[PDB]
Design a protein around this ligand. Structure first.
Ligand SMILES: [Ca+2]
Length: 410
C-alpha cells in the first residue's frame, strides 16, 4: 500500500496527495479553459464528465479545506463555483440546458450550501454569495411549475419539459431539494425551508421510493404510470442523501419522527451498501465495466455525507465512524496503480487495483471518491456545519426571483 492513514498526520499527508492527484484531472484554471468543469461533456468528445460532476468536485474541495485546513486550492475552487452560476445566480447557465436536471442544479446548490456551512471564504462583494446561491437553487426548485399534480407531486428529473427524462420523477432530484431545504432551515432558522423539506420527504415515502418495510431507497418512477413502475435500483447516494437531510431535520426540529427516520435510513444503508465494512455500489460494482462516470462518484458522497451526519446527529457516531474507517482503509489499499504507484481505482471491496479504463474514463470519479473518504477520516477534528449564528456568508431574499429568471418564460 502507498498511502498511510494511521495517525492524524498520516491522514493529512495522504489527503494532500490525493487532493493533488484529483486536481491533475482538472484543467479549468488554465488559460483558455472553462472554470468549474472537469473535461467533457462526452457528448462533445471533450472528455468523460458532465457539468454536475464539476459541481461535485467543487464541493469535495470545500470539504477538503474544512477537514484538513489546507487552503491551497481555495482560489481555484472559488473561481470554478462562481463561473458556473449563470446570469441569474441560480446555477442555471443556459449554455448547459441539456444538463439541467434538478439533480444537476441541486448538486451545485449543495456545494454552495456546504461553502456557507464550512465558512469557505466569501466571493467578492459584487459577486453572488454562497448562502444566496443555495437559496436561489432551492427557490427555483420550489417554483410552482416544478410541482404539478402527477403522482400527487414531486419534482421531475429534468427542468426543461422537452429534455429526455422529464417524465421520470426520481429520487435524486427530490433528495437534492429535500437536503437543501433541511440545510437552509438549519442555517437560516427559517421554517418555510423545513416545511418544504417535510413535504418532499413525505412524498418520497408515500410514493414508495422509500420502502416502507426495509427503508431501501429506490431510483424513481414515471408519470405515465402514476410513478408506480418503480425502478428498484438502489444507488448509494440516494439513501445517503436522504439520511443527510433527515439528520439536518432531526437537528433542527428535535422531533422524534426525524430521529426515527435517521435511524431507519442508516440501518438500511449499513445493511445494503456496506459489505464487510466497505462501501459497495450495488447496482453496478459486482462486475467490471458496468458503472457509469456518474456512479463512480457516489461512494465519495456517501463517506462525506455520513461523516457530517455524525456531527449533527451525534447518536449515530458509533454506528458510522468505524464503518467509514474500514471502507476508507479499503479505498487506500487499492490506490497502488501504475504509473505512479498510487493511482486509485473503484473496486475497494475487491482489494485490488482495477484500471479506470475498464469503466471507460480517465478515473476522476475514483480519485474524487478516495479523496472524500480519506479527508472525512478527519471529521472528529472538524467543526460542525455553521448556522447563521457563526457563518460568514450572506443571503438574498429575492434569490431565484429575478424577472429574467427562467421560470418567467417556462
Ligand atoms: Ca470515455
Amino acid at each position: 500500500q502507498y498511502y498511510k492513514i494511521d495517525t492524524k498526520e498520516e491522514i493529512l499527508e495522504s489527503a494532500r496527495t490525493l487532493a493533488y492527484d484529483m486536481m491533475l484531472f482538472y484543467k479549468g484554471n488554465q488559460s483558455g479553459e472553462i472554470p468549474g468543469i472537469l473535461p467533457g461533456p462526452p457528448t462533445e468528445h471533450k472528455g468523460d464528465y458532465y457539468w454536475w460532476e464539476g459541481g461535485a468536485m467543487m464541493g469535495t474541495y470545500v470539504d477538503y479545506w474544512h477537514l484538513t485546513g489546507d487552503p491551497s486550492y481555495n482560489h481555484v475552487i472559488m473561481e470554478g463555483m462562481l463561473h458556473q452560476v449563470g446570469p441569474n445566480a441560480d446555477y442555471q447557465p443556459p449554455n448547459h440546458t441539456a444538463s439541467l436536471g434538478n439533480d444537476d442544479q441541486g448538486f451545485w446548490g449543495m456545494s454552495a450550501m456546504l461553502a456557507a456551512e464550512n465558512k469557505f471564504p466569501n466571493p467578492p462583494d459584487d459577486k453572488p454569495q454562497w448562502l444566496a446561491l443555495a437559496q436561489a437553487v432551492w427557490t427555483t426548485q420550489a417554483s410552482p411549475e416544478r410541482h404539478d399534480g402527477t403522482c400527487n407531486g414531486g419534482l421531475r428529473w429534468q427542468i426543461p419539459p422537452t429534455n429526455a427524462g422529464y417524465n421520470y420523477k426520481n429520487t435524486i432530484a427530490n433528495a437534492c431539494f429535500f437536503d437543501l431545504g433541511a440545510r437552509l432551515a438549519r442555517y437560516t432558522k427559517n421554517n418555510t425551508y423545513a416545511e418544504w423539506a417535510e413535504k418532499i420527504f413525505d412524498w418520497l415515502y408515500a410514493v414508495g421510493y422509500i420502502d416502507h418495510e426495509t427503508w431501501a431507497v429506490y431510483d424513481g418512477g414515471h408519470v405515465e404510470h402514476n410513478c408506480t413502475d418503480i425502478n428498484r435500483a438502489q444507488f448509494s447516494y440516494n439513501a445517503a442523501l436522504l439520511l443527510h437531510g433527515a439528520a439536518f431535520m432531526w437537528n433542527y426540529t428535535e422531533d422524534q419522527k426525524w430521529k426515527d427516520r435517521v435511524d431507519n435510513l442508516l440501518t438500511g444503508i449499513l445493511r445494503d451498501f456496506f459489505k464487510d465494512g466497505v462501501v459497495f455500489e450495488i447496482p453496478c460494482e459486482g462486475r467490471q465495466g458496468a458503472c457509469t462516470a456518474d456512479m463512480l462518484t457516489f461512494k465519495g458522497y456517501v463517506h462525506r455525507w455520513m461523516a457530517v451526519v455524525t456531527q449533527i446527529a451525534p447518536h449515530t457516531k458509533d454506528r458510522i465512524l468505524p464503518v467509514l474507517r474500514t471502507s476508507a482503509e479499503a479505498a487506500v489499499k487499492q490506490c497502488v496503480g501504475p504509473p505512479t504507484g498510487r493511482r486509485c481505482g473503484f473496486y475497494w471491496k475487491s482489494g485490488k487495483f482495477v484500471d479506470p479504463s475498464v469503466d471507460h474514463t480517465s478515473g476522476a470519479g475514483e480519485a474524487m471518491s478516495v479523496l472524500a473518504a480519506v479527508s472525512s477520516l478527519l471529521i472528529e477534528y472538524a467543526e460542525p456545519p455553521a448556522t447563521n449564528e457563526t457563518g460568514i456568508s450572506r443571503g438574498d431574499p429575492n434569490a431565484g426571483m429575478r424577472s429574467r429568471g427562467a421560470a418567467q418564460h417556462f
